[PDB]
């Protein structure tokens, strides 16, 4: 019966906001796109403008090549049949070369070479996007927290696709490009290394993924509960603490016995999120290269009855 | 009668769109059921009559 | 009895009642079709030897 502030009840539109021109080449920035009332019911209605620099276009074209390579392989697997393509869309897979090729690049296209091509494209796209996040932060004079938070996820991705295959000595260890295919790869990876549940770093990574869900629920709910005091304007609460920040702090102080500040809760948030992929990459790197049976390792380290 | 009062409460536009979706779903379902029964698949029946397959 | 339209909003009750009517009716029709004693098309096909 009361307004929960989940959806805006009255939308307001003014002149298009071009943004802050700190050091941004206004040539690279595109024009403001359309206004989406559907998106405006939940957040901002404005689309664009989007910046397109050197790294932006490099990453966009490299990612387009990766996506197109996978899609053309999928069309080949369908026998160029659109009905088959739609029927088996989730069952298609661009697989890495068989283990007998090792890390060599001399695998046939149908048996792993096209996977290497798509992998190179993806590698370029992701690293150019990382540089792009760093440079976009730099142009506006902001800190580089987004770049390092992205670097954590990039490290999990690199361990999965690049570093662990090299350590294990074959491209066959890497992840195929496919919807159900990479799910099968995940399940098989767990089975081969003996119940990845007993990997300590898989356990910590899950602790932090659960903790990210918990913490974003807590933080979103807290900010919505104090939005009646302008609590969603967190930067001004950092600069000039209002009653929203105090009420949020006191809620969690009286509930848990300790609280955060408007600025430090975001340190909690960023670390809780990055630890997911950081710990996960460590665990995946250890799997196979150091421990090949995590249940037996568990038994030898407590964690499981002998 | 006095049925036009039904337009004094419900938005005409969404009524018409919902009616169109409902009618299309029903017609498609009825035709598909007729196809499912081999004794009313007019393509199959015509193939049997004209010795097509 | 007449107060049901006061507590309950007409649109929700009308739409839900009609939706339930349609789904229950089509379920009854499906059940009748499924068993071989109320599938009228099969009865007609066997009757006219068009099967």
């Amino acid at each position: 019966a009361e307004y929960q502030n989940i959806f805006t009840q009255v939308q307001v539109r003014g002149p298009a906001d071009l943004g802050m021109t700190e050091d941004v080449n206004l040539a690279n920035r595109s024009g403001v796109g359309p206004f989406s009332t559907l998106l405006g019911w939940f957040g901002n209605a404005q689309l664009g403008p989007i910046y397109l620099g050197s790294l932006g276009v490099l990453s966009l074209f490299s990612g387009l090549m990766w996506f197109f390579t996978i899609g053309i392989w999928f069309w080949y697997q369908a026998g160029w049949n659109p009905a088959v393509f739609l029927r088996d869309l989730f069952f298609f897979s661009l697989e890495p070369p068989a283990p007998e090729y090792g890390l060599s690049f001399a695998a046939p296209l149908k048996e792993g070479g096209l996977w290497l091509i798509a992998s190179f494209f993806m590698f370029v796209a992701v690293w150019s996007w990382w540089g792009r996040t760093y440079l976009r932060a730099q142009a506006l004079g902001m800190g580089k927290h987004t770049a390092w938070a992205f670097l954590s996820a990039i490290w999990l991705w690199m361990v999965l696709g690049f570093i662990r295959p090299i350590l294990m000595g074959s491209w066959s260890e890497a992840v195929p490009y496919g919807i159900f295919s990479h799910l099968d790869w995940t399940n098989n990876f767990s089975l081969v290394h003996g119940n990845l549940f007993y990997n300590p770093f898989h356990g910590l990574s899950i602790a932090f993924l659960y903790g990210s869900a918990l913490l974003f629920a807590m933080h979103g709910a807290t900010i919505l509960a104090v939005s009646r005091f302008g609590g969603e304007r967190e930067l001004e609460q950092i600069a000039d603490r209002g009653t929203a920040a105090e009420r949020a702090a006191l809620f969690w102080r009286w509930t848990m016995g300790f609280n955060a500040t408007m600025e430090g809760i975001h340190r909690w948030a960023i670390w809780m999120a990055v630890l997911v992929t950081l710990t996960g990459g460590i665990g995946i790197l250890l799997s196979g290269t150091v421990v090949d049976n995590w249940y037996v390792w568990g038994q030898n380290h407590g964690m499981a009855p002998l | 009668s006095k049925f036009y009062k039904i337009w004094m409460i419900f938005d005409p536009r969404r009524v018409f769109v919902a009616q169109g979706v409902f009618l299309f779903l029903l017609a498609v379902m009825i035709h598909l059921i007729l196809l499912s029964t081999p004794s009313y698949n007019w393509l199959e029946i015509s193939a049997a009559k004209y010795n097509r397959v | 009895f007449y107060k049901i339209w006061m507590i309950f909003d007409p649109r929700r009750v009308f739409v839900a009642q009609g939706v339930f009517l349609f789904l229950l009716a089509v379920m009854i029709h499906l059940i009748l079709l499924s068993t071989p004693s109320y599938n009228w098309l099969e009865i007609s096909a066997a009757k006219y030897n068009r099967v």
Binding site: - | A18 | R12, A16
Partner: peptide, 13 residues
């Protein structure tokens, strides 16, 4: 949208 939320296409259009 929640007022017309009591399939989805009816509210969608």
């Amino acid at each position: 949208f929640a007022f017309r939320l009591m399939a989805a296409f009816f509210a969608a259009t």
